[PDB]
Design a protein around this ligand. Structure first.
Ligand SMILES: Cc1cn([C@H]2C[C@H](O)[C@@H](COP(=O)(O)OP(=O)(O)O[C@H]3O[C@@H](C)[C@H](O)[C@@H](O)[C@H]3O)O2)c(=O)[nH]c1=O
Ligand SMILES: Cc1cn([C@H]2C[C@H](O)[C@@H](COP(=O)(O)OP(=O)(O)O[C@H]3O[C@@H](C)[C@H](O)[C@@H](O)[C@H]3O)O2)c(=O)[nH]c1=O
Ligand SMILES: Cc1cn([C@H]2C[C@H](O)[C@@H](COP(=O)(O)OP(=O)(O)O[C@H]3O[C@@H](C)[C@H](O)[C@@H](O)[C@H]3O)O2)c(=O)[nH]c1=O
Ligand SMILES: Cc1cn([C@H]2C[C@H](O)[C@@H](COP(=O)(O)OP(=O)(O)O[C@H]3O[C@@H](C)[C@H](O)[C@@H](O)[C@H]3O)O2)c(=O)[nH]c1=O
Ligand SMILES: O=c1ccn([C@H]2C[C@H](O)[C@@H](COP(=O)(O)O)O2)c(=O)[nH]1
Ligand SMILES: O=c1ccn([C@H]2C[C@H](O)[C@@H](COP(=O)(O)O)O2)c(=O)[nH]1
Ligand SMILES: O=c1ccn([C@H]2C[C@H](O)[C@@H](COP(=O)(O)O)O2)c(=O)[nH]1
Ligand SMILES: O=c1ccn([C@H]2C[C@H](O)[C@@H](COP(=O)(O)O)O2)c(=O)[nH]1
Lengths: 293, 293, 289, 293
């Protein structure tokens, strides 16, 4: 099974003006790499090799100049455009031909996922052939998101988009795994009062059918988005603290692709050669000697 | 029941002058004293009997902060180390406290954080013979006890601050031992740097084929606080998670409550003197807010 | 011969539990205890006689940290405040220490930093009569004494914690007084919030036409540490400056040395027990840099 | 009528990959693009005519970010530098722009902050003959032009990146020049490193007795952003001030408004499309604010 991945990295509004005035939010740094490296690496760790990047028409060339066609990482990366940010579920209209008759995953281009055993959880979700998987995460401001209502046993009862009175602090994260039904469901839902095709309508539909796994993503994980200037810089210092302590890089696509044998040592060296003087290139070269289990 | 020791003794003048009057483990890591973090790690391991070892002058300062632990359904006792003459002294000083039980040692300035930590601590705690240490990939392994690995799994050596570290895996400040450790610690002699070495304890188990090295993956944060910079970074790391989640790292009242070591009545009694501040409100919210555990 | 007071007493439980065992003003701001900063501010103002007021339980810890100040060519004395009953109580407790000299009060948790701070402190210390306070634009002025200005920006009134602040300018925690202040502090009565208010002291000088309210511009950092967030933010702020410059903010040995209160031999005696750490190396570099 | 040049050209690949995507000087420093900071420094010195020099690839990106400056009552023009062949090249590329007027050069990645900065820039800006540079005590002076001082602490020479620095005082990335500078730059010859050195430009003024070297005290922040660490630290530095004060560092609308380059009506036209975000709110409060003398 070849699950097809979608990174939605389109228009993010003007909350961060003026740092997003010229530059797309998802090309801005989180410490030492562009933001979009993080959700890209999350898909790679889930085993996904076919990725569609959806951005605004104005910014697609900027993303393409950054990531290419993915062949440098043994991946296939393609591009499509979203003229206005008219809903997350619109990804499954724009990306319908890319998805084909395959399972898929959607991730937001500004969402950072980090924590121990993340790969096992993403691999279990990626491997299921029917139904859907989303993740629930305790946050300070749940009213910003789709919010999960849980019974005493943490069985999911409902999902509401931006409720006035959140039923819990558990938000639906910006990562979704779907079987082959999702594109047709996306054709059946209707734009909401805020004028958007709602991923929450997709998700509540799977929940009503008894086909939604709502997985708790515990407090040991970091699920960060970067909605304010404070939380953007906080995500950067968070990554820096881990990397400097460990001598390991978070979300290095060459590392992940090499460890999964999507690229070999020769290809790692070819990527490192123009970067030999800087820290990223030296990190790539050090992959060929290093031992990590 | 496994008995825990927090070694919170003298740290020298490395951090002068912030440690001139006050012990390091009473200093803040963001919003709570440092020692709350290793204490909470022992509690997460299921350990309820804890010995605090500090300098004689600082014992009252720690006792005023933690008491006898009965407020958290624990038993906390105190012993002294006049001079920081080696980690293995925890099992000489703590010999009567350990008695004939299994034990664990944790450093008072070590912060462990990450998803599923409890499962790993419980697995180590469940061993009935041998010892368990945790290996963590760091930038500068020569600062620590270093694990050497063969091509496969096994750890084949541990070396204290080697000139040529045989790997990047540092032995963390958390150790689990069977009933042999107190006699082993009485049998070894101080090293060339004049200290009773936990590495020499661990090498005794290794030579007997009784040392398990549990890998602590890059998804975990293992932070210590050896410099002014790393001390303040540990604070900003905690702050990023807590501001994101609305959850507290290392709240002993929370952990004891969720484990049913204390009930809702006791939580309320602890919240009563703090009613106005954020910590008291956090304690109150434990009884009303739904949090998965 | 102005005499200084550092008010480093009970700060309540807002920062609980980091202040449960240890007093706020002994906690680190990056690489040194908080109280080093306001102490160094007094030193930069030229003040060599300092009274530290803390709770009864914490004076030994402050005394262990600073001693009698003779190591820096200063005189540091200690007094206690049983309950935190108002900033103006500093001049009741410290009345005998002040004597009939001019004085200055600074809060033990206030950090002042910026270019030409010394010149501004020297002008205030040089006033013969009256008082000087500093006004600083802040995000949350309602937490403080707030300055009301007339149309031409003269200070005309001050109110403690106003419901609707009349400006964004707070009175900082640094105050200069002539010989009137101790008798003024004995005359005021506790306010509705039950405290002897420094705003009442300052209002009396202002009502008499004897208060200079000096604007402290946005180029200065005036930091207190009222939240866990602002405590750590002050630390990263100091760290960025020090790591960039290779210079230390608020090193008392440095300040006493550059002011010739101690000589090169005294610096070396202070550095010798600190030889292994970075602070001792900084002291040694004072003689070479 | 002094004319300003912001040198914001090729920065190399030390910051790869965050500069693969975006030009360095468009990267965020907390809540605004890096280039806002040096732009505002020129504005505080009273300079209204600014030349931005960048790479050919990056000039369009700066243009979309800043326009022609008429929105701030300024005149902003653009020129290109195909190769980063030396700071002194700004006065070759920008020779026509300067004409026969005095000028100033600032680095596009340099942040200046501190009390009375305006008074010092105004003094430098008014000097009819000669040039003015700034000396600043730094940890690592060998990275820069280093000032040599005599016993009387008067400047004797400037060495570019000496192996053995004669002081800790570096020349900051801000320079004021008379009408000699454009001819002097065409006169100089490339150094052992194929670059036209501003240090050589400055030496000519010094040898002629026409260089003022002003000490910039430890109360000022002079920051550059040469590493991932120093880039993010510059952001946290700004954030601490702004959150404490409720004032923004380097808001060009604010500086231009207070200098009467634009009027209240113009500020409102700028705020209107930004009404929902924090920056627009800040512009609106300028018309109601009490912040003056
Ligand atoms: C709506 C939308 C957003 N985006 C981008 C902008 C942001 O970087 C990112 C999210 O934008 P928002 O306005 O916050 O989307 P949003 O308001 O729909 O937030 C979503 O957040 C998820 C985490 C929850 O699971 C959802 O239930 C929902 O709450 O996606 C697009 O590119 N296209 C779009 O159509
Ligand atoms: C030596 C010692 C330290 N300490 C405190 C001081 C610090 O807070 C903390 C660590 O002190 P150090 O000098 O760094 O110890 P250390 O130099 O012995 O380091 C140890 O570090 C562990 C992480 C490794 O697993 C060990 O193998 C070893 O490297 O423990 C005591 O309380 N008592 C002592 O006897
Ligand atoms: C009241 C009081 C405080 N303190 C300490 C506690 C804090 O560290 C510090 C300030 O305490 P607070 O309760 O915040 O004080 P406060 O509530 O009086 O705040 C003061 O702040 C100044 C900056 C203003 O200029 C004053 O006008 C006033 O607003 O002083 C004492 O040591 N003793 C006391 O009696
Ligand atoms: C050389 C050069 C740099 N730049 C950019 C790249 C950086 O963002 C910035 C500085 O470039 P560097 O390689 O560091 O140049 P540099 O090595 O000349 O550093 C300079 O630093 C100044 C602060 C000192 O006053 C000078 O004396 C000098 O030391 O300017 C250009 O745009 N064009 C150029 O030709
Ligand atoms: O009340 C609690 C529960 C957990 N943890 C810490 C222990 C581990 O570091 C991590 C557990 O994360 P999960 O296993 O819930 O994802 O959080 C706390 O500090 N307090
Ligand atoms: O090359 C890699 C491997 C893992 N991770 C991330 C994915 C998860 O967030 C975490 C995995 O940690 P462990 O499960 O190995 O502890 O690190 C990377 O960024 N790059
Ligand atoms: O030894 C010293 C000298 C100065 N400063 C502080 C006081 C002011 O905040 C600032 C003075 O800056 P300048 O006036 O020297 O630029 O530095 C110190 O902390 N220690
Ligand atoms: O609108 C303004 C005014 C000043 N400053 C900066 C320039 C100096 O770095 C400092 C001036 O502080 P004072 O000179 O007002 O103290 O603030 C700005 O960024 N924007």
């Amino acid at each position: 099974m070849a699950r097809k991945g979608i990174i939605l990295a389109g228009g993010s509004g003007t909350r961060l003006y003026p740092i997003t005035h010229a530059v797309s939010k998802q090309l801005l740094p989180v410490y030492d790499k562009p933001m979009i490296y993080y959700p890209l690496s999350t898909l790679m760790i889930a085993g996904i090799r076919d990725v569609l990047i959806i951005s605004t028409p104005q910014d697609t060339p900027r993303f393409e100049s950054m990531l290419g066609d993915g062949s440098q990482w043994g991946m296939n990366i393609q591009y499509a455009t979203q003229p206005s940010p008219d809903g997350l579920a619109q990804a499954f209209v724009i990306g319908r031909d890319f998805v084909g008759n395959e399972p898929s995953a959607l991730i937001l281009g500004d969402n950072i996922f980090y924590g121990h055993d993340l790969a096992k959880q993403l691999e279990r979700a990626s491997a299921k052939d029917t139904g859907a998987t989303v993740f629930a995460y305790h946050v300070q401001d749940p009213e910003r998101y789709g919010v999960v209502e849980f019974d005493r046993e943490f069985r999911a009862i409902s999902i509401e988009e931006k409720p006035a009175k959140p039923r819990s602090s558990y938000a639906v994260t910006g990562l979704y795994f779907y079987d082959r039904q999702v594109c047709d469901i996306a054709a059946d839902i209707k734009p909401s009062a805020r004028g958007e095709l709602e991923i929450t309508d997709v998700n509540s539909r799977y929940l009503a059918a008894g086909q939604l796994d709502v997985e708790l993503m515990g407090r040991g994980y970091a699920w960060l988005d970067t909605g304010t200037h404070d939380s953007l810089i906080e995500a950067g210092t968070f990554i820096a603290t881990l990397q400097k302590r460990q001598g390991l890089m978070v979300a290095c696509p060459e590392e992940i692709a090499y460890r999964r044998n999507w690229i070999d040592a020769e290809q790692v060296l070819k990527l490192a050669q123009p970067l030999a003087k800087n820290a990223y290139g030296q990190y790539l070269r050090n992959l060929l000697t290093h031992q990590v289990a």
